Every structure is written in C-alpha cells, then in structure tokens.
Ligand binder design. Structure first.
Ligand code: NAG
Lengths: 50, 49
C-alpha cells in the first residue's frame, strides 16, 4: 500500500506543478506584451517628436 | 515618419520578399556624414528690425 500512497502524493504534486507552470506562462506573455509597448514608446517619444 | 519603426535613420522605401514561413523586408535608409562645425545666431536685426 506504500506504492499507492506515494502514487497519490506524486499525482497531486504533479497537478499543482502543472497549474503553477501554466499561470507563470500566462503572466510572462502579458509582461512581454507590456514591455514591447514600453520599448515602442521609448523608441518613438524620446528619440524624436510624436 | 515615426522614428526607428522600420530602418535605422530616415526611411526612404522598402521591398518585401517571401520566406519558408515568414516575410523579409529590405529597408532603404538615408544617413548623413562628413559633418562640419559652424557659428550660429538666432536672429539678425537690420535697421532696428
Ligand atoms: C568644431 O570645433 C569644436 C571646437 O573645438 C570642436 O569641439 C568640434 O569637434 C569641431 N567639429 C568637428 C566636426 O570636429
């Protein structure tokens, strides 16, 4: 029964890790979009005139 | 007219080309060089004007 117990623990922890990775991916995508906008603003409204 | 959008400098024109799974832009740009130093002045008044 120790195999059963450790299997339950392993599957639960794997589910938690998967959820965390997905959330991190979404947050990274949003941050990348915002930073692209910031880079465009830096290139346009500083090195010239808008 | 937006600075550094396409090209590095003042933009003249571009030519598109295909790729396996994308596009390639060839930008033509104009860049000054061979500078010289001079003495300036804001405005010049003659006969009080
Ligand atoms: C013009 O003269 C100034 C005065 O020393 C100098 O600093 C500047 O470098 C000169 N211009 C060029 C293009 O060298």
């Amino acid at each position: 029964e120790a195999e059963v117990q450790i299997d339950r623990l392993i599957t639960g922890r794997l589910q938690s890790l998967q959820t965390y990775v997905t959330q991190q991916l979404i947050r990274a995508a949003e941050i990348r979009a915002s930073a692209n906008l910031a880079a465009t603003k830096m290139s346009e409204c500083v090195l010239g005139q808008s | 007219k937006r600075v550094d959008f396409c090209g590095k400098g003042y933009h003249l024109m571009s030519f598109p080309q295909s790729a396996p799974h994308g596009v390639v832009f060839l930008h033509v740009t104009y860049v000054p060089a061979q500078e010289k130093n001079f003495t300036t002045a804001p405005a010049i008044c003659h006969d009080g004007k």
